[PDB]
RNA sequence: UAAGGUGAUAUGAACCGUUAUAACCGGCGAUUUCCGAAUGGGGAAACCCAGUGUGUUUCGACACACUAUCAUUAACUGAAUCCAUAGGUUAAUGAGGCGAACCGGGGGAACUGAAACAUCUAAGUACCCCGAGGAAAAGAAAUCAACCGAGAUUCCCCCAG
RNA sequence: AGGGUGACAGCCCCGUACACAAAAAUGCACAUGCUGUGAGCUCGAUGAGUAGGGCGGGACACGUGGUAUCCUGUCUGAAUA
RNA sequence: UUUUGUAUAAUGGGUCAGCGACUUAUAUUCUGUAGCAAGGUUAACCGAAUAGGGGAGCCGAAGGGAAACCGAGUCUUAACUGGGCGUUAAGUUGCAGGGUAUAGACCCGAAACCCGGUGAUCUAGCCAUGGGCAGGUUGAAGGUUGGGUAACACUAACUGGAGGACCGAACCGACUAAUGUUGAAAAAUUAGCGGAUGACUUGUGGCUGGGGGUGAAAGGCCAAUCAAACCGGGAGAUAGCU
RNA sequence: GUUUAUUAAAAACACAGCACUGUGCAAACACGAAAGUGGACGUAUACGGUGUGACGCCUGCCCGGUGCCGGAAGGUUAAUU
RNA sequence: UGAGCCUUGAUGGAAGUGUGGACGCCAGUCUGCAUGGCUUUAAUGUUUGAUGUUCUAACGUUGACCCGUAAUCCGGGUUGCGGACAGUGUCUGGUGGGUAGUUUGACUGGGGCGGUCU
RNA sequence: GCUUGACUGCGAGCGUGACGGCGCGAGCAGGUGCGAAAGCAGGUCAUAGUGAUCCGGUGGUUCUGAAUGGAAGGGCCAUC
């Protein structure tokens, strides 16, 4: 449902606010692209519906430190 | 993105180098493929001495035998009787094997490729300026004296 | 608790009690058809059909009981590929649905007012959706003050239209 | 207090003040057994894709205004007493 | 009632009985009135509850200047003048009333706008599966045989049986007239009329839902409703009008 | 043949035919926040859109304006830095 | 190929003849390749943009096959094709009656037209 | 001819407006000019030649400036 899956980023709702200050609900949504990550240690290819930046996380922490959680909260993958 | 290397890799290969390459080239090839691992403490603050575990240690502590040059000195007149003949000469050939094997006395046994013969040893009888240079590092000074029966 | 009782329109009829469970009142239970989350499957709600068991058996019938899905865990099984997973079966747990308001969260109008109308207003209201408790939410300063100091949050009165 | 009773009753009736009563079942307090939690003391440790920042929005009484502060869809991204 | 003006042939009322429209909360200012007086008065809250306590605070006795600031003065100005606003006006708190503000704000009334649902048992398209079309007529293509040709063309009889083909019941439809118009009927009856093997007609069930559907297109149909359905809500929308 | 069920059956809609134009298929296009679906289990002799409306003889001149198609060298120009 | 950064380059073992390059204030020279006794423009390096090629390894696949599975879905696997393109998110220029909210004055010998408005 | 009174601060008192506002104004203070002087000049013989507020721009000012010193901003005066 368009969710970062790793950071839980969802599509927020805002206003278009065109010139003359005209309000018009628009709503923003995450990047997401679903990657083909290689757990390596788990010796498998786990594809997750990640998202820009949310991917930078997989790098900063770990494709395992990430999956450390996720499965922690009982998620897919 | 830094990460340590683990193989050839064109513009970067030190089987343990740290180069800042795009995170795309990584987590897509250099990594998940077997070619490099992120530079994360453990991969360093726990694997950084493995590198300095030689040039720094296995280079000056390695006394396994490098002290050979120093060990060989206390001798009792290292001489080899190549046997004289015909107005005084040599029946044998004191080249290399003999100079290095000049330790088979007390059953001891030293190297051999540690010869110091800038040229093909000649035939005489006097002392040989043979400097049994063990390791390509430390030198030495062994003597050889041809005689007869 | 008691001399009267078998709810009402409802008399009557057959009866039950006057000393101790006659009636009736309160606690705890028993039974509690079928529909309905409805859960064995199906379905035009209250109906149609099945599998596996089971006892008395005229030993067939009878009927009754278990069998939904998902989640966690445990055991056993187990593909593409040694492995290993995926998948499969079982069991034990728990959820499911309903409900007045109050409460937290997701989403969010317009009429209207501006004596017209776009910014602005109505209003984060109405409304939809999710979740929770007896309350919720909030909460022990990376708060505020002003060189003096105060010391979490919450609610009321002021400050001040 | 109040209600009923053949018209308006303190003393007809039911109640009323007051004083009493629980096999059991339970709300809430305490107090305790069980399971689980785990107290205290010495020395340590001190919340990074985070704080900030650019773009777009939103919340702040505060309509970007000279506009601090809070939140984040997007791109970034530190010090570390 | 409305009007310059109504017996007015201008509005409203058949009649009666009951109901039916300037309210309420808070705030602000006046008037009356009571308390106290350069003072008046408490708010929440405590409570031995209409007490008593609580004076946080609000209003008033000082004003002028944009302000710093000064002060019965103060601004203006270089001006110590003049000029403006002030200075020997009693205020304050209740209680009742007049007015105003925020509220539905005297009462009743739109056409409408927005939000969530209910409707394809009528109708419009389509989907699946079944049914129907008395009778009478015309007679295409193709074929056989004779003629004909070098062979084909071509020809004529017969055979054959086509068609949004012809006449006409059922069935479908709806051009005309009359009657009906408080109808027999919220569109029909009667006499005529058009199609009638087809883009035909009909039964059962299904699918499209409202700014949306469907439409051989009239804005037509979407349950006697349609230039945006019905139901409930925002809602006592708004009504400088009656 | 179709049409304003309930004042309009028509010269109106439709029609076979004609023309232009878009679409190389995961088609154009349409329903849908998306998944997906229709187009079509079709594939340019196909499908969509538009206008004209059997058939006969025909369908002239204008590309200035607007639209569409091609060019895109040069002028102007967003965020971004 | 821009632009940088800066290392090696010109004006601010020995003569004597050739053959390029730089323009020549031109007739002068500068500077390169045998035999003979800091400021201009580069070259490699290195960075970083602009194109444009090739690659695979993200990503696409509504090609083929295998397993879940005696499923057209979906997921995993293999292979082929494509490939950093496409596509999506955020930002941004164009287009945009497809849709939405509205505006579009009053006077007036009825209104409108005409005229008027200080 | 010579000049800058088309000056600065104020203003008794009036006129005219529902109001916002508009107009006339002797005289006072400071500095000007013209004249020998009295004196005249605060734009044109007069009456049309015009746009309130807000939001801002510019110059000036020690008015204010959110802990304090500055500063941004605000006020005041001139002006677009
Ligand atoms: Mg069921
Ligand atoms: Mg059942
Ligand atoms: Mg309005
Ligand atoms: Mg009249
Ligand atoms: Mg009358
Ligand atoms: Mg009456
Ligand atoms: Mg016919
Ligand atoms: Mg007929
Ligand atoms: Mg039907
Ligand atoms: Mg209708
Ligand atoms: Mg309302
Ligand atoms: Mg109303
Ligand atoms: Mg006809
Ligand atoms: Mg009609
Ligand atoms: Mg008709
Ligand atoms: Mg036509
Ligand atoms: Mg023509
Ligand atoms: Mg419009
Ligand atoms: Mg409106
Ligand atoms: Mg008018
Ligand atoms: Mg004049």
Curated annotation (Swiss-Prot), chain A:
<dbReference type="GO" id="GO:0005829">
    <property type="term" value="C:cytosol"/>
</dbReference>
<protein>
    <recommendedName>
        <fullName>Large ribosomal subunit protein bL28</fullName>
    </recommendedName>
</protein>
<keyword id="KW-0687">Ribonucleoprotein</keyword>
<dbReference type="GO" id="GO:0002181">
    <property type="term" value="P:cytoplasmic translation"/>
</dbReference>
<keyword id="KW-0699">rRNA-binding</keyword>
<comment type="similarity">
    <text>Belongs to the bacterial ribosomal protein bL28 family.</text>
</comment>
<dbReference type="InterPro" id="IPR026569">
    <property type="entry name" value="Ribosomal_bL28"/>
</dbReference>
<keyword id="KW-0689">Ribosomal protein</keyword>
<dbReference type="InterPro" id="IPR037147">
    <property type="entry name" value="Ribosomal_bL28_sf"/>
</dbReference>
<dbReference type="Pfam" id="PF00830">
    <property type="entry name" value="Ribosomal_L28"/>
</dbReference>
<dbReference type="GO" id="GO:0000027">
    <property type="term" value="P:ribosomal large subunit assembly"/>
</dbReference>
<dbReference type="GO" id="GO:0003735">
    <property type="term" value="F:structural constituent of ribosome"/>
</dbReference>
<dbReference type="InterPro" id="IPR001383">
    <property type="entry name" value="Ribosomal_bL28_bact-type"/>
</dbReference>
<comment type="subunit">
    <text>Part of the 50S ribosomal subunit.</text>
</comment>
<keyword id="KW-0694">RNA-binding</keyword>
<dbReference type="GO" id="GO:0005737">
    <property type="term" value="C:cytoplasm"/>
</dbReference>
<dbReference type="InterPro" id="IPR034704">
    <property type="entry name" value="Ribosomal_bL28/bL31-like_sf"/>
</dbReference>
<dbReference type="GO" id="GO:0022625">
    <property type="term" value="C:cytosolic large ribosomal subunit"/>
</dbReference>
<dbReference type="GO" id="GO:0019843">
    <property type="term" value="F:rRNA binding"/>
</dbReference>
Swiss-Prot record, chain B:
<keyword id="KW-0689">Ribosomal protein</keyword>
<feature type="modified residue" description="N6-succinyllysine">
    <location>
        <position position="71"/>
    </location>
</feature>
<dbReference type="InterPro" id="IPR036791">
    <property type="entry name" value="Ribosomal_bL9_C_sf"/>
</dbReference>
<dbReference type="InterPro" id="IPR020070">
    <property type="entry name" value="Ribosomal_bL9_N"/>
</dbReference>
<dbReference type="GO" id="GO:0005829">
    <property type="term" value="C:cytosol"/>
</dbReference>
<dbReference type="InterPro" id="IPR020069">
    <property type="entry name" value="Ribosomal_bL9_C"/>
</dbReference>
<dbReference type="InterPro" id="IPR036935">
    <property type="entry name" value="Ribosomal_bL9_N_sf"/>
</dbReference>
<dbReference type="GO" id="GO:0005737">
    <property type="term" value="C:cytoplasm"/>
</dbReference>
<keyword id="KW-0699">rRNA-binding</keyword>
<keyword id="KW-0694">RNA-binding</keyword>
<feature type="modified residue" description="N6-succinyllysine">
    <location>
        <position position="112"/>
    </location>
</feature>
<comment type="subunit">
    <text>Part of the 50S ribosomal subunit. In stalled/collided disomes (pairs of ribosomes where the leading ribosome is stalled and a second ribosome has collided with it) bL9 in the collided ribosome contacts bS6 and uL2, while it contacts only helices of the 16S rRNA in the stalled ribosome; the inter-ribosome bridge thus formed is different from that formed between normally translating ribosomes.</text>
</comment>
<dbReference type="InterPro" id="IPR000244">
    <property type="entry name" value="Ribosomal_bL9"/>
</dbReference>
<comment type="function">
    <text>One of the primary rRNA binding proteins, it binds very close to the 3' end of the 23S rRNA.</text>
</comment>
<keyword id="KW-0007">Acetylation</keyword>
<dbReference type="GO" id="GO:0070180">
    <property type="term" value="F:large ribosomal subunit rRNA binding"/>
</dbReference>
<dbReference type="Pfam" id="PF03948">
    <property type="entry name" value="Ribosomal_L9_C"/>
</dbReference>
<dbReference type="GO" id="GO:0002181">
    <property type="term" value="P:cytoplasmic translation"/>
</dbReference>
<dbReference type="InterPro" id="IPR009027">
    <property type="entry name" value="Ribosomal_bL9/RNase_H1_N"/>
</dbReference>
<dbReference type="GO" id="GO:0022625">
    <property type="term" value="C:cytosolic large ribosomal subunit"/>
</dbReference>
<keyword id="KW-0687">Ribonucleoprotein</keyword>
<dbReference type="Pfam" id="PF01281">
    <property type="entry name" value="Ribosomal_L9_N"/>
</dbReference>
